[PDB]
């Protein structure tokens, strides 16, 4: 399923997911797209921060849902 | 002078401050707009995570400033 993915600068990234996908996955491929390491990255979706070791499902995020990325 | 905060789903929170503000002071006008407990908010401006014993001015933020919100 495609998931959306906006940035501080008001920049919207698509990206390809299954919802047994990880987080730390998903970071992965943010990293690819945009060369923000992992670790400088905090996701966040209906106001809540996503932990690296849980899935897109385990939040009941489904197809076109829109994640929140900051930077520290 | 006002500044404006962003949130993680794409909101954008106007809020009335003075240089002399303190961040917790920043925080408990937010807790009132939104009710999100102060512990549980974090806010970054430039890249950089305010805390909660320095002023608005100790970090050079200037009128119509956007500060980002992150929960934890």
Redesign the interface.
Known sequence: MQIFV?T?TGKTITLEVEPSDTIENVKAKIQDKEGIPPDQQ?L??????LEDGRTLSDYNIQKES???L???
């Open positions: 906006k501080l905090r966040i979706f209906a106001g809540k921060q829109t994640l929140h900051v930077l520290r």
